[PDB]
Amino acid sequence: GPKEWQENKSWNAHFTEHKSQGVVVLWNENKQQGFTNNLKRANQAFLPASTFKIPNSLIALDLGVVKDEHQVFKWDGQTRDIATWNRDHNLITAMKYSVVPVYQEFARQIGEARMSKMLHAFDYGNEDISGNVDSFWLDGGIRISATEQISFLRKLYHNKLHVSERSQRIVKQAMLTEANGDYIIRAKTGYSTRIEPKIGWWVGWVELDDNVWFFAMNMDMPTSDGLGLRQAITKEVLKQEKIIP
Amino acid sequence: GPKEWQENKSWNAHFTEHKSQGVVVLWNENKQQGFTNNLKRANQAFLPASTFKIPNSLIALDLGVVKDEHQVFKWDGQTRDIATWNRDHNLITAMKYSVVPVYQEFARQIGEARMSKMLHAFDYGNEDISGNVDSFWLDGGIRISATEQISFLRKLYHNKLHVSERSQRIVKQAMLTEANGDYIIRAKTGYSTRIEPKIGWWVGWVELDDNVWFFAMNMDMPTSDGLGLRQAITKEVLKQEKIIP
Ligand SMILES: *C(=O)N1C[C@H](NOS(=O)(=O)O)CC[C@H]1C(=O)NOCCN
Ligand SMILES: *C(=O)N1C[C@H](NOS(=O)(=O)O)CC[C@H]1C(=O)NOCCN
Ligand SMILES: [Cl-]
Ligand SMILES: [Cl-]
Ligand SMILES: [Cl-]
């Protein structure tokens, strides 16, 4: 009978066409079935890098570190390499421009004891926060696979994480990436650069009228010049599968 | 001293270019200033028609008539003129396809006494539900102006309406119309067809990185062939004002 996970190796052509290597994982929520070009890499756990902004946001909101999505976190005045980081942000714009220093402040205020407890409650990856509480997702011990990202996102979608429904709704709002009459994408990018292998991430879901497709992709990323391929390769797969036009 | 409300008659050219007549009203939230091509029509009160799905959704959720935005409302098997209505819906798709029969059932469950009480609590328009409990917003006594639509939407944006924050967040999600890196539009269309003058509505807001612009427009609409002009004329104004590219 039907399998929970199937391999579609033809998706490899979208990686090969872009001289890239990696994995796309899709989950069809209505059918409760998943699909991937590489089931082994789908289960390979990596540093989450900026995709950790999703659980970090949830925990900061539920503990009151962040009051709501419009509370301002002022620039600390240190000029950093990414110009959009050198300004004041709220939760929405800090996720959109992936403003690491704002989320490091969130993590410091959460603190290691509460961070560990909440990642255990979330069943999140290997749940390991060894390192600095404000960098373990960049250069510490936490690891999460693409399929574990989907597991986490499915709980978030259904408001079933062990945090308030309010925090889950706010974070799903902050994840909004694209919307038109054909679909809504809620997602977060990431780029793990400090520990080899350097990889790019894109995790989230596509909302249709009558279904939701969760996705999690990662790919080898030796330089930042290829970062647009995270979304491009994913969208090529979504187009091949007739999920988006 | 600066003016809270200012008239910009140059927007009339966008109506004339499309052989149309109507009003666009904008509110700049950061500046606390409003702008319109027609100050009198901005304050004239009309039937809300399908823009009433915003307060109706809020009331249905807060009263428990609708449990959440994924609860399925099954098609009643009656084949109606609009093909997208002849389907099962949830709150998200019922708002998107503006599925009147679903919202008439909400209104019947709410009932006259609770509907009236809640519209008074919302300060919604003239607060008058005279007529049929399931059609007063189409052919009964309720009236709301474009400026009153903005007032109501600003309360919704800030979670200040007299319903749970949860219901307000769910409805703001259901209002999602378009999103890209440049802006998010949350809005609801309507077409008042039963009492003259027939008018098209578009009410909502445009979220930018650092500001939000509320808008409410209505325009004479003798035929459904012109309904695309509601968004087109509004967007021409937003482009003229450099709010969207
Ligand atoms: C997170 O992965 N970040 C922050 C920022 N994210 O941009 S995105 O990859 O488009 O979401 C830039 C890349 C990455 C970092 O540079 N983080 O700090 C160093 C650890 N990789
Ligand atoms: C509400 O304004 N409705 C329902 C539907 N809305 O579509 S929209 O105008 O694009 O938002 C069509 C127009 C209008 C009605 O006609 N409603 O009356 C009951 C069905 N004729
Ligand atoms: Cl981060
Ligand atoms: Cl949203
Ligand atoms: Cl309606």
Numbering used by the authors:
A (entry chain B), B (entry chain A): 21 to 265
What does the primary publication say about this deposited structure?
The OXA-48 carbapenemase is widely disseminated in Enterobacterales, necessitating new treatments for producer strains. OXA-48 is a class D SBL that uses a nucleophilic serine (Ser70) to hydrolyse β-lactams, with a proximal post-translationally carbamylated lysine (Lys73) proposed to act as the general base for both the acylation and deacylation steps of the reaction. Diazabicyclooctane (DBO) inhibitors, including avibactam and nacubactam, act on a wide range of enzymes to overcome β-lactamase-mediated resistance. Here we describe investigations on how avibactam and nacubactam inhibit OXA-48 and two variants, OXA-163 and OXA-405, with deletions in the β5–β6 loop neighbouring the active site that modify activity towards different β-lactam classes.
A crystal structure of nacubactam bound to homodimeric OXA-48 was solved at 1.51 Å resolution, from a crystal soaked with nacubactam for 30 min before freezing, with a chloride ion positioned at the dimer interface, as observed previously. Continuous positive Fo–Fc electron density between the ligand and Ser70 indicates the presence of a covalently bound nacubactam-derived carbamoyl-enzyme complex. The avibactam and nacubactam carbamoyl-enzyme complexes show a similar binding mode to OXA-48, with the nacubactam C7 carbonyl group positioned within the oxyanion hole formed by the backbone amides of residues Ser70 and Tyr211, as seen in β-lactam-derived acyl-enzyme complexes of OXA-48-like enzymes. In contrast, when Leu158 adopts the g-rotamer, observed when nacubactam is bound, the channel is closed, and the adjacent water is modelled in dual occupancy with the Leu158 side-chain, due we infer to steric clashes (Leu158 Cδ2 is ∼1.8 Å away from this water molecule). When OXA-48 is bound to nacubactam, in the active site of chain B, Arg214 of the Ω-loop adopts two conformations. In both conformations, the Arg214 side chain is poorly resolved in the final 2Fo–Fc electron density map. Thus, it is possible that the side chain of Arg214 and the C2 tail nitrogen of nacubactam are electrostatically repelled in crystallo due to clashing positive charges. Chain A of the nacubactam complex, in contrast, does not show this effect, most likely due to a crystal packing contact, whereby residue Glu132 from an adjacent molecule in a different asymmetric unit can electrostatically interact with Arg214, thus holding it in place. Consequently, the C2 tail group of nacubactam adopts a dual conformation in the chain A active site, presumably as a result of electrostatic repulsion by the Arg214 side chain. The structural studies reveal conformational variability of this loop only in the OXA-48 : nacubactam complex, as a result of electrostatic repulsion between the C2 tail nitrogen of the nacubactam 1-aminoethoxy group and the side chain of Arg214.
